[PDB]
Amino acid sequence: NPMERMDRDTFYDNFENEPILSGRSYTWLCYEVKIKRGRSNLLWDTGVFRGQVYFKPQYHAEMCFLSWFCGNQLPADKCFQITWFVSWTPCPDCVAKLAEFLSEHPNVTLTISAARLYYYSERDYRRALCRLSQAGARVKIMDYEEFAYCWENFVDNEGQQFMPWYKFDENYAFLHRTLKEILR
Ligand SMILES: [Zn+2]
């Protein structure tokens, strides 16, 4: 149901960290599921989901992931560390489902590293990601090391190197400052 990797064209088209970006109607979600216990850190599952940014939340990458995880990684007692590399942050409805999921599964931790911020409404801007962070999720902007890590593991790079966008650095700086404001 998830793929192993996306092709290079897809990665470049969807993970460019322009704060204002039109036409990227999908969310791509790269995940690593690890069994984590202090210094032990076992890679357990990896893959890629694609979903819609809009339409009903059943079509969203985050619910694609959650439905797969509950059906295929649970039931289990392990301590899971879930890492996402996402092209957009989650919509407010998926924030609510993810926050509820985390509150009911204290053995799961989630980190979301995003290429871009979802365009939140006035009401959701200082609420949605704040609620998710308060439920214990770590929400951050994807930095260069994470883009390179994604190129290596979630892209059919076929030997090529990751070539970052010319505005990468100032885009990152603007996004990091905006998220800091969103989270207090
Ligand atoms: Zn959603």
Curated annotation (Swiss-Prot):
Tissue expression remark: Expressed at high and moderate levels in peripheral blood leukocytes, spleen, testes, heart, thymus, prostate and ovary. Also expressed at low levels in several other tissues.
Additional comment: It is one of seven related genes or pseudogenes found in a cluster, thought to result from gene duplication, on chromosome 22.
Binding site for Zn(2+): 60, 91, 94
Reported induction: Phorbol 12-myristate 13-acetate (PMA) induces overexpression in keratinocytes. Up-regulated by IFN-alpha.
Species this chain originates from: Homo sapiens (Human)
Protein name, UniProt field: DNA dC->dU-editing enzyme APOBEC-3B
Protein family per UniProt: Belongs to the cytidine and deoxycytidylate deaminase family.
Taxonomic superkingdom: Eukaryota
Upper classification of the organism: Eukaryota, Metazoa, Chordata, Craniata, Vertebrata
Domain CMP/dCMP-type deaminase: 23-132
Function field: DNA deaminase (cytidine deaminase) which acts as an inhibitor of retrovirus replication and retrotransposon mobility via deaminase-dependent and -independent mechanisms. After the penetration of retroviral nucleocapsids into target cells of infection and the initiation of reverse transcription, it can induce the conversion of cytosine to uracil in the minus-sense single-strand viral DNA, leading to G-to-A hypermutations in the subsequent plus-strand viral DNA.
Domain comment quoted from the record: The CMP/dCMP deaminase domain 1 mediates RNA binding, RNA-dependent oligomerization and virion incorporation whereas the CMP/dCMP deaminase domain 2 confers deoxycytidine deaminase activity and substrate sequence specificity.
Cellular location(s): Nucleus
Assembly and interaction partners: Homodimer. Interacts with APOBEC3G. Does not interact with APOBEC1.
